[PDB]
Design a binder for this molecule. Structure first.
Ligand code: SF4
Length: 351
């Protein structure tokens, strides 16, 4: 807004290049980056080992502006759901704590174009791609809130997943540098095994991803055959299951963050994809792809075309897969979470 460079938009190299233009040596960029990501600092004044002159330069041409929280919802089990303001739009960020880990689910887009029939985001349609600052800024903001204070169980973020609003492979230009910052020693310093990109299967973009970065891959499959997938996840019409699975294999040739084993996501949809015959078909489909299968007890929202699969159907589905020796997990569901308002506020201030 002020015509200043948001430093959260910049990877290590771009940061160094920017600092070079300020007439500063590359080490000063690394130093500021460290303050930004190791101490979640967005205030140049708090950077005590930087001299006043450099501080003055930075305040004039740059800022550290992460997206703000407009709604926080805290659950019993420790799960936090944030609504995040991105310009004039809203995205979602979710913190999920566990005993041995803490996972952040980060949005890649404002809305989505993929039209997955089980997805409430798909209802909105695609608005825009998120900028680097608005992706990495979700991690930054969450880490600040989780760190600031200070509750039992909620350890610092250990894992980040590109899983939320939007298809990450349709925003490669912003998703890739964001992940680079997550991975970087001077950024969040996360292992590549703990940075996971989840995709529904944009094949040429996946081929592209593997040439750009080494990060863990997860796939949103959600169906055992092409006729069912064409219906539930329309992008399958462009790139079918076999085209998707071959692209996964090509990615694993360039990348070893997965250690050969991709996580496969599968929402359970009442009488759509949750039958024993579907499970047997899934096992056959996945016989040549090393995997862990996450069966997801999906909950309907108002207007959803599908119902929840019963627990006994999910159980029988799980057992079929286990009989073939697949590592399969029924994912423990986490959390239980006006138009005239602006004019009303104006009419109130009048009194
Ligand atoms: S890719 Fe993800 S966000 Fe996009 S419509 Fe499908 S499930 Fe929804």
């Amino acid at each position: 807004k002020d015509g200043k460079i948001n430093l959260l938009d910049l990877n290590r190299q771009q940061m160094r290049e920017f600092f070079k233009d300020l007439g500063e040596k590359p080490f000063r960029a690394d130093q500021v980056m460290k303050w930004m990501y190791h101490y979640c600092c967005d205030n140049f004044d708090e950077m005590t080992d930087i001299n006043k002159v450099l501080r003055g330069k930075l305040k004039e041409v740059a800022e550290i502006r992460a997206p703000e929280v407009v709604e926080e919802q805290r659950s019993s089990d420790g799960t936090i759901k944030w609504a995040i303001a991105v310009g004039d739009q809203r995205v979602e960020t979710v913190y999920i704590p566990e005993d041995d880990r803490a996972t952040l689910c980060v949005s890649s887009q404002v809305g989505c174009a993929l039209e997955c029939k089980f997805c409430s985001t798909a209802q909105q349609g695609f608005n825009r791609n998120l900028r680097v600052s608005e992706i990495i800024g979700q991690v930054w903001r969450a880490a600040k809130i989780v760190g600031a204070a200070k509750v039992t169980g909620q350890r610092p973020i250990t894992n980040v997943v590109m899983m939320g609003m939007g298809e990450p492979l349709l925003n490669l230009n912003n998703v890739v540098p964001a992940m680079e910052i997550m991975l970087d020693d001077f950024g969040f310093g996360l292992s590549k095994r703990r940075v996971t990109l989840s995709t529904s299967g944009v094949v040429p973009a996946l081929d592209k991803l593997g040439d750009m970065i080494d990060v863990a891959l997860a796939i949103s499959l959600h169906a055992p055959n092409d006729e069912i997938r064409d219906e539930i996840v329309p992008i399958n019409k462009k790139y079918n299951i076999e085209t998707f699975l071959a692209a996964v294999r090509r990615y694993l040739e360039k990348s070893n963050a997965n250690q050969g084993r991709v996580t496969i996501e599968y929402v359970m949809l009442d009488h759509v994809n949750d039958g024993t015959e579907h499970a047997h078909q899934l096992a056959e489909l996945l016989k040549d792809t090393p995997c862990k299968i996450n069966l997801i007890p999906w909950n309907p929202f108002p207007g959803a075309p599908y119902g929840r699969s019963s627990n006994s159907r999910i159980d029988r589905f799980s057992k079929v897969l286990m009989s073939y020796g697949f590592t399969t997990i029924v994912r423990k569901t986490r959390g239980d979470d006006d138009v005239i308002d602006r004019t009303k506020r104006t009419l109130r201030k009048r009194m």
